[PDB]
Design a protein around this ligand. Structure first.
Ligand SMILES: *[C@@H]1O[C@H](CO)[C@@H](O[C@@H]2O[C@H](CO)[C@@H](O[C@@H]3O[C@H](CO[C@H]4O[C@H](CO)[C@@H](O)[C@H](O)[C@@H]4O)[C@@H](O)[C@H](O[C@H]4O[C@H](CO)[C@@H](O)[C@H](O)[C@@H]4O[C@H]4O[C@H](CO)[C@@H](O)[C@H](O)[C@@H]4O)[C@@H]3O)[C@H](O)[C@H]2NC(C)=O)[C@H](O)[C@H]1NC(C)=O
Length: 360
């Protein structure tokens, strides 16, 4: 009976599925956009406004530009930035601190003016950098530990929640289990749409004899069974998953997720017009040792493999990986954008010293 499903015959598939199941209820840090450069730029905007004329300061003391400028594209773009700067400068002692940092406390009017003009090219250089950093911030604002946890819990357990996801056939199988195990253990009337459903299909001990208990590992203590046609799969899944200790690397990376999906894709085997994960002998993935303990990717072929990536759990993990791929790069970019903007802030605080000494 070497060709039947025997104990340990699905053990290597199970190791990969255990790694995927450990993405449930995940608490990971995500690469963060370093937004300290936005504050550095705001400080430059505050210095610029402090040094401005009484006529200019009067425009802010709101909501949109004054008559004559409501349609000027530069005023439309800058209005919220200027308003934020004016609001910050109303705070007790804020303007005095801004001027002190710039060496402009008690500065003569001619020095204040020359200093403001000296900031023109500096602010023009910094504007481009700050706008890119703001774009990065917005483009990655949905890449958070909470959104990732929810997406991965959808992948593993079919439950759109950040924590407390647990096995429930009503969620792990799309629409709950089917009339028969063979029909439940199909994906691509798709049913086995989560990692947990995949583990049930590849590992469960059916009731009624002729089962393939311990296919996923001899150390599983199947204390019960999955019932007939997976009717009580939850009890058996608990015993199977109790053997899984996997932990993903932290912080979670796109590369790790991509490697997990690639590994699965490299294990699916095509026979007679379908794909299979888990040992398949004959008839269907019914849970009987002489038939199969498997997911049938119905109609999946090498050439239609793109459809594997549309199965819900695969799509959810792919979406997380795509988001992390972007945020990893944008986070590394943001470190430098913010360092540059802090340097521009320091530069702006130095112009007065040059101007004083040039005048003297
Ligand atoms: C640091 O703080 C200073 C204030 O101390 C602030 O400066 C102000 O910046 C704005 C935005 O660049 C300047 O806006 C220009 O204003 C002129 C008219 O200026 C008069 O009126 C204003 C408001 O009462 C007075 O402050 C000023 O002294 C003058 O009395 C407009 O003509 C400008 O419009 C052209 O440029 C825009 C881009 O900046 C275009 O969007 C717009 O379409 C116009 O361009 C077109 O027309 C041009 C003329 O024909 C042509 O040459 C172009 O090719 C194009 O066809 C603009 O609205 C304002 O004057 C500045 N005020 C002072 C006192 O300097 C800085 O913005 C701030 N720095 C930062 C980084 O925030």
């Amino acid at each position: 009976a070497a060709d039947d499903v025997n104990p340990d015959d699905n053990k290597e598939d199970f190791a990969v599925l255990c790694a995927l199941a450990a993405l449930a209820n995940l608490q990971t840090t995500v690469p963060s956009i370093d937004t300290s450069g936005l504050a550095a730029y705001d400080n430059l905007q505050q210095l610029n406004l402090s040094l401005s004329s009484k006529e200019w300061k009067s425009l802010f003391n709101p909501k949109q530009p004054p008559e004559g400028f409501q349609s000027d594209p530069t005023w439309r773009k800058q209005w919220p930035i200027w308003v934020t700067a004016a609001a910050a400068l109303k705070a007790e002692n804020k303007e005095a601190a801004v001027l002190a940092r710039a060496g402009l406390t008690n500065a003569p009017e001619e020095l204040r003016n020359r200093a403001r003009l000296a900031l023109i090219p500096l602010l023009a250089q910094a504007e481009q950098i700050r706008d890119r950093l703001s774009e990065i911030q917005k483009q990655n604002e949905d890449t958070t530990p909470t959104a990732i946890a929810k997406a991965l819990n959808k992948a593993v357990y079919g439950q759109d929640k950040e924590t407390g996801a647990v096995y429930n056939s009503a969620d792990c199988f799309s629409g709950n289990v089917a009339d028969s195990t063979q029909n439940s253990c199909k994906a691509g009337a798709s049913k086995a749409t989560t990692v947990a459903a995949t583990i049930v299909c590849v590992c469960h001990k059916k009731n009624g004899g002729n089962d393939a208990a311990n296919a996923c590992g001899r150390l599983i203590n199947h204390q019960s069974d999955a019932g007939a046609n997976l009717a009580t799969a939850s009890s058996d899944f608990g015993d199977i998953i109790a053997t899984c200790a996997a932990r993903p690397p932290k912080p979670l990376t796109a590369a790790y997720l991509d490697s997990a999906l690639a590994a699965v894709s490299a294990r699916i085997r095509f026979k007679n017009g379908n794909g299979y994960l888990g040992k398949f002998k004959a008839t269907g993935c019914t849970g009987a040792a002489a038939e199969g303990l498997c997911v049938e990717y119905t109609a999946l072929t090498a050439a239609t493999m793109q459809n594997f990536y549309k199965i819900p759990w695969v799509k959810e993990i792919s979406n997380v990986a795509e988001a992390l791929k972007r945020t990893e790069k944008d986070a590394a970019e943001s470190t430098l954008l913010s360092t540059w903007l802090k340097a521009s802030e320091n530069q702006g605080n130095s112009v007065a010293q040059k101007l004083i000494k040039v005048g003297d």
